[PDB]
Ligand SMILES: Nc1nc2c(ncn2[C@@H]2O[C@H](COP(=O)(O)OP(=O)(O)NP(=O)(O)O)[C@@H](O)[C@H]2O)c(=O)[nH]1
Ligand SMILES: [Ca+2]
Ligand SMILES: [Mg+2]
Ligand SMILES: [Mg+2]
């Protein structure tokens with residue numbers, strides 16, 4: 001079976017861990033425990049083939065973000081996550097895109113832009129603004145909620161499959 005190495009990046013608190021845990025373990029993490037670097041692995045059938053997903057859940061807090069670059073190196077595709085109620089996290093997305101380009105030494109890396117926390121009503125990033133950013137990068141934009149599960153499989157499966165196009 002084919003192995004896909006996925007990496008989830010973005011600012012502190014945007015819901016990287018909650019997204020990954022919802023996908024892999026089918027529950028919502030309500031509390032906020034900042035991540036250093038965690039890994040998850042699971043076999044799943046995507047569009048008709050058994051896939052081993054290896055998912056690296058990275059730190060968004062700068063204090064916990066030491067050595068993030070080395071662990072990301074083997075990443076084949078990246079989820080770049082912001083929260084729709086956190087304008088700064090959206091403005092921060094370029095930092096992550098630049099880091100990915102530097103770790104992979106490439107301008108053509110499989111990626112998906114994810115607007116998380118779409119269940120929340122205090123939206124400050126409109127869908128259209130994020131679509132425009134994604135278009136500039138040549139990548140999909142998908143909204144998610146780790147709380148309700150909306151879009152969660154779609155985000156990770158879009159990623160696994162952008163990889164199949166490269
Ligand atoms: N309402 C709502 N809350 C969410 C969602 N995703 C995450 N949260 C909440 O936001 C907080 C931070 O989530 P977490 O997944 O830890 O964020 P992170 O991006 O992994 N943080 P770090 O970079 O420090 O590891 C938690 O309280 C979590 O419940 C979501 O889709 N909706
Ligand atoms: Ca819970
Ligand atoms: Mg985390
Ligand atoms: Mg490099």
Ligand SMILES: [Mg+2]
Pocket residue numbers: 124
């Ligand atoms: Mg505005």
